Design a protein around this ligand. Sequence first.
Ligand SMILES: *[C@@H]1O[C@H](CO)[C@@H](O[C@@H]2O[C@H](CO)[C@@H](O[C@@H]3O[C@H](CO[C@H]4O[C@H](CO[C@H]5O[C@H](CO)[C@@H](O)[C@H](O)[C@@H]5O[C@H]5O[C@H](CO)[C@@H](O)[C@H](O)[C@@H]5O)[C@@H](O)[C@H](O[C@H]5O[C@H](CO)[C@@H](O)[C@H](O)[C@@H]5O)[C@@H]4O)[C@@H](O)[C@H](O[C@H]4O[C@H](CO)[C@@H](O)[C@H](O)[C@@H]4O[C@H]4O[C@H](CO)[C@@H](O)[C@H](O)[C@@H]4O[C@H]4O[C@H](CO)[C@@H](O)[C@H](O[C@H]5O[C@H](CO)[C@@H](O)[C@H](O[C@H]6O[C@H](CO)[C@@H](O)[C@H](O)[C@H]6O)[C@H]5O)[C@@H]4O)[C@@H]3O)[C@H](O)[C@H]2NC(C)=O)[C@H](O)[C@H]1NC(C)=O
Ligand SMILES: *[C@@H]1O[C@H](CO)[C@@H](O[C@@H]2O[C@H](CO)[C@@H](O[C@@H]3O[C@H](CO[C@H]4O[C@H](CO)[C@@H](O)[C@H](O[C@H]5O[C@H](CO)[C@@H](O)[C@H](O)[C@@H]5O[C@H]5O[C@H](CO)[C@@H](O)[C@H](O)[C@@H]5O)[C@@H]4O)[C@@H](O)[C@H](O[C@H]4O[C@H](CO)[C@@H](O)[C@H](O)[C@@H]4O)[C@@H]3O)[C@H](O)[C@H]2NC(C)=O)[C@H](O)[C@H]1NC(C)=O
Ligand SMILES: *[C@@H]1O[C@H](CO)[C@@H](O[C@@H]2O[C@H](CO)[C@@H](O)[C@H](O)[C@H]2NC(C)=O)[C@H](O)[C@H]1NC(C)=O
Ligand SMILES: *[C@@H]1O[C@H](CO)[C@@H](O)[C@H](O)[C@H]1NC(C)=O
Ligand SMILES: *[C@@H]1O[C@H](CO)[C@@H](O)[C@H](O)[C@H]1NC(C)=O
Length: 986
Amino acid sequence: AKGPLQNIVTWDEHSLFVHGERVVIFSGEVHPFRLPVPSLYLDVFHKIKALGFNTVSFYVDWALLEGKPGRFRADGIFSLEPFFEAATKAGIYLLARPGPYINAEVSGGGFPGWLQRVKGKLRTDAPDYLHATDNYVAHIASIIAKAQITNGGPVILYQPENEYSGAAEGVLFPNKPYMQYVIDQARNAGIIVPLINNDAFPGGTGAPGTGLGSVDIYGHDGYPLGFDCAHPSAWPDNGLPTTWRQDHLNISPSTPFSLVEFQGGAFDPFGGWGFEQCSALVNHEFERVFYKNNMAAGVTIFNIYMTFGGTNWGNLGHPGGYTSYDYGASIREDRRIDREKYSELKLQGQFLKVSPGYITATPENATQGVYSDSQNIVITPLLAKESGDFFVVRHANYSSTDTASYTVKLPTSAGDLTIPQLGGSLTLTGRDSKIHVTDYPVGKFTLLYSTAEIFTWNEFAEKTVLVLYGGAQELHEFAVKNPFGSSKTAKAKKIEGSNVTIHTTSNLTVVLQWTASSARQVVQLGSLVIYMVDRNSAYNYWVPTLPGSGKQSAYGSSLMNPDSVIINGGYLIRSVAIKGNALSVQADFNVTTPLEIIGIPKGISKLAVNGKELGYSVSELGDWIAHPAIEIPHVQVPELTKLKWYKVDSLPEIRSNYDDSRWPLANLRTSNNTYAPLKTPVSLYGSDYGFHAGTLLFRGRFTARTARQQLFLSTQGGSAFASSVWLNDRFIGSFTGFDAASAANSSYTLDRLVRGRRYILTVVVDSTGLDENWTTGDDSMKAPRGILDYALTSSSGANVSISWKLTGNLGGEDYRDVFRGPLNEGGLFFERQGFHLPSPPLSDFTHGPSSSSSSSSPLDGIAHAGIAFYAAKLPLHLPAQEYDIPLSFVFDNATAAAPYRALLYVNGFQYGKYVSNIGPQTEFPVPEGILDYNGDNWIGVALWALESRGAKVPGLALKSKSPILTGRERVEVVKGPHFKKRHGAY
Ligand SMILES: *[C@@H]1O[C@H](CO)[C@@H](O[C@@H]2O[C@H](CO)[C@@H](O[C@@H]3O[C@H](CO[C@H]4O[C@H](CO[C@H]5O[C@H](CO)[C@@H](O)[C@H](O)[C@@H]5O[C@H]5O[C@H](CO)[C@@H](O)[C@H](O)[C@@H]5O)[C@@H](O)[C@H](O[C@H]5O[C@H](CO)[C@@H](O)[C@H](O)[C@@H]5O)[C@@H]4O)[C@@H](O)[C@H](O[C@H]4O[C@H](CO)[C@@H](O)[C@H](O)[C@@H]4O[C@H]4O[C@H](CO)[C@@H](O)[C@H](O)[C@@H]4O[C@H]4O[C@H](CO)[C@@H](O)[C@H](O[C@H]5O[C@H](CO)[C@@H](O)[C@H](O[C@H]6O[C@H](CO)[C@@H](O)[C@H](O)[C@H]6O)[C@H]5O)[C@@H]4O)[C@@H]3O)[C@H](O)[C@H]2NC(C)=O)[C@H](O)[C@H]1NC(C)=O
Ligand SMILES: *[C@@H]1O[C@H](CO)[C@@H](O[C@@H]2O[C@H](CO)[C@@H](O[C@@H]3O[C@H](CO[C@H]4O[C@H](CO)[C@@H](O)[C@H](O[C@H]5O[C@H](CO)[C@@H](O)[C@H](O)[C@@H]5O[C@H]5O[C@H](CO)[C@@H](O)[C@H](O)[C@@H]5O)[C@@H]4O)[C@@H](O)[C@H](O[C@H]4O[C@H](CO)[C@@H](O)[C@H](O)[C@@H]4O)[C@@H]3O)[C@H](O)[C@H]2NC(C)=O)[C@H](O)[C@H]1NC(C)=O
Ligand SMILES: *[C@@H]1O[C@H](CO)[C@@H](O[C@@H]2O[C@H](CO)[C@@H](O)[C@H](O)[C@H]2NC(C)=O)[C@H](O)[C@H]1NC(C)=O
Ligand SMILES: *[C@@H]1O[C@H](CO)[C@@H](O)[C@H](O)[C@H]1NC(C)=O
Ligand SMILES: *[C@@H]1O[C@H](CO)[C@@H](O)[C@H](O)[C@H]1NC(C)=O
């Protein structure tokens, strides 16, 4: 760490500077590879920009971009260019986090499965590991380098590595040569923006001052609330972080206090609680108490992990999670922004971006009974000589759901005051926290104090507007230094409301008291207009920024205090633009509402909403009240059970005529897997043969020595895997799986054999992904998939040899679907043939009447253990131009039903792994873009019946959410290749 390499993005003890402007970086985490629809990145960026955020943080997943060693590929849905372009179009900057290790609840933590064949320890300077990363970093860091702000792009910060924060016993840590090699790779590829790290906790690793391997800005992470979604109302003792200001001063006082990942939800395992329960844990209450507690410590680079989670499509996830990555985040997996936590987060983002005095105020120790007589609240001051103070108030027991009555005694430029000055008590209701301010600048005006929270303010050409809010029934008071200019006759004017009271002192400080309610109060003081609302009304206000000019026009006039228009109403305001005398608004509506526009730019006299001009009413304050057309239609979608379903056997391997001459031989007598030394005479680890994704199959030949033999089989597929075994066409048994099992020891009897005859065992082993590698020196990502051990013995105890063949996805690292990437397909027969792709060869399938013995529907299923694949055309004709209509596939989980596993495919993309006996996911959202809302789709369901009774899907339906009338940019269908007969398939 030796200072900035450029002068566009710089820093000091208090903040980043971008183009010379101090800024609070308020960022949301988005992972481009979890939303493979390029034209929807702008939708999510619009939703994050509207929170008041200025930045997005993103991972890149190496395993998707270098599935074949030596062949980096970031094209099509894997290109970052549409992601960068959308950031520029939205006016969002980016923190790039390309790893190589990212963790991220993705398969291998980002490491491609061929790292199982690297002997050295991962995330160390073992040269076989280091040099295995070089091609990926050279390519991805040069892509990121071109997108830097120094080249006119959105990238302002780069993170090397990920939570490099401790190691296994005996392993060098921190390994400074390792850390510096990782930095050098990025610098050598042209990264010149500052480097920021993300220590898992405040351990000091890589901080400035630590020499070799140090980054520019020390960052760390925090997930205090934890992940016990089992008990969403429980906030445990000592869960609130109380040491981070002092830890920051101890570790890196020269750089901004940075939380590079702060909890925005929780992951959820197989057999978990579901993301709705996680969103109830990490809810709006969590945000206002815990996020304001980070403001109490002066955070000025603050990223919320996750803000939009997306989906672990195409097997990209790790075994510790399932298909959904909704995360309980403020933006749902289907991109809806109806959770209350979204609107609460917007209040916080909009506050910070108009409050530059927050940056240079000094956070001090938390206090009790100092800034209030009350001991039942804790107050943390951020103090400044003249630029304004901030006071973060919480219950002393941070978990408390009680209501507290209090007053405060705060320092001001007019001396210390007990507030309310006009009588009465403030209220702090359960799991709330507030920021009170003193000497807060509002343009030319100054708030001597305010107990109500600030949503936004701006100086418009004819008035200054300030929007303040409280929770309902809270009494609040604020005071404005003489707002009347040289006038010694001017007075306050009540415009709306009958609750606000106003008292003016001899020096013309105006003191206003009001009790928040659903009825807005509005008072005009000179050219200052204050709108006083309750919190639930403030949730519906928006502050879109007015564009500048040129390529960077969407970044507006500045990052802090930008030129803006204030809009009351709407489910989303995406943007505003001026053209001539017209203000054009892009907006989404999920319910009817008026729109009230506050702060009309000079010279503008026309209004348009989503391209349609409309009139408006003008208020005495010059606000516009408009009533755009909002029709929310009934939507009908096709019944999946009435589609024309086609079926194909996807376990032809067990039929006596099956030829496996094309299958890879499992004949490697040694392995480079140093984490799981071989127990078997040949490797039966998928990754040793190039198979890293999805289900594996093994075929073991033996000659019977006795009529009865005993088979021991140890399989490993990752948490919640399963495995099934046949002897020729005879079902032997399944390990049916559970949340806590990543491997299984099974024992089976192979009876009634003909001595001297050859038999073939077919063993199917699912994989739920490769494990993460969070502890350096513990090569846990190298945990293999397949058969760990076996023993076949005759009835006299003799050992019986087995010779093996195996497969995963056809081609292995020479994977067949370059468009959908290296992990989308597993090894099941239908996948290997490409039968999951659009327009499959229906002559290879069967069709027959549902509920008949010739049924080809997944609703009728199969009457024996085995695996079938079902395909159907799903035409959709929905009004996607005008409406955002989220669609999802829902499986009915019938309590008494034989266990099965299913895979969901939509136009060739795998969009769901359903595990009927483990759960918890039953609803599988699929985005527009992957689905064609005005054309033919192909839907696929694989059904793996684990028990000899067989299985069926009890119910399968397409579900829609309420249509949202939308002003988004149009969604283009992703052009995934259709089926084509594969040469060399088996
Ligand atoms: C449809 O519908 C249906 C109905 O009808 C449904 O179903 C269902 O389902 C469910 C769910 O899935 C289920 O339940 C489940 O179950 C399961 C199973 O059970 C069974 O088994 C068991 C076990 O066993 C074993 O073990 C033992 C001892 O060990 C023994 O004894 C035995 O033998 C066995 O053993 C074997 O195995 C093993 C394994 O492999 C081994 O080890 C050994 O050696 C051998 O091998 C048992 O126990 C049980 O039992 C019991 O029960 C029974 C009944 O069944 C009975 O009979 C008995 O007696 C007794 O009683 C059985 O058997 C299980 O597992 C589970 O459990 C859970 O849960 C509960 C509650 O609920 C509890 O209690 C427990 O404890 C557990 O827990 C857990 O989980 C939860 C949830 O999630 C939580 O909350 C908690 O906390 C815990 O957790 C943990 O674990 C897990 C696993 O388990 C995981 O996952 C986790 O983790 C994760 O997470 C966390 C958060 O929280 C985090 O933190 C972590 O992380 C980490 O990591 C990362 C990365 O990776 C990093 O980064 C970071 O940093 C950190 O953080 C993660 O990982 C934790 O760990 C349950 O129970 C049931 O069953 C069913 N039912 C029927 C009727 O079926 C379905 O689901 C539906 N579907 C849909 C689609 O929806
Ligand atoms: C169209 O899109 C809009 C978004 O633009 C969607 O609107 C959102 O819809 C969601 C879902 O319904 C709403 O969230 C849920 O809100 C309910 C209702 O509570 C909220 O509103 C009432 C007013 O109607 C407030 O009084 C509530 O605030 C009190 O309670 C909360 C605790 O629930 C507390 O934190 C507050 O401080 C406040 O407490 C004060 O009053 C209470 C009650 O008297 C008093 O006891 C206390 O002492 C204080 O005085 C709150 O703002 C809420 O019940 C739901 O929560 C429960 O579920 C979630 C899990 O989902 C848990 O996290 C939570 O802990 C509860 O168990 C939700 O929060 C959301 O507010 C709403 N947003 C807006 C902008 O309207 C529409 O749904 C979309 N429509 C369609 C058709 O698509
Ligand atoms: C801090 O406040 C919380 C919330 O009021 C308290 O947690 C309650 O604790 C009681 C007694 O253990 C439980 O029966 C309730 O279920 C809890 N409620 C919640 C929502 O979790 C807590 O005890 C207080 N802790 C301190 C240290 O006094
Ligand atoms: C095992 O590692 C050696 C280097 O010692 C390398 O030559 C070989 O290619 C590796 N095997 C596999 C199949 O990757
Ligand atoms: C399987 O048994 C072996 C002993 O041969 C043991 O080492 C291993 O832990 C067992 N695995 C599981 C999942 O029980």
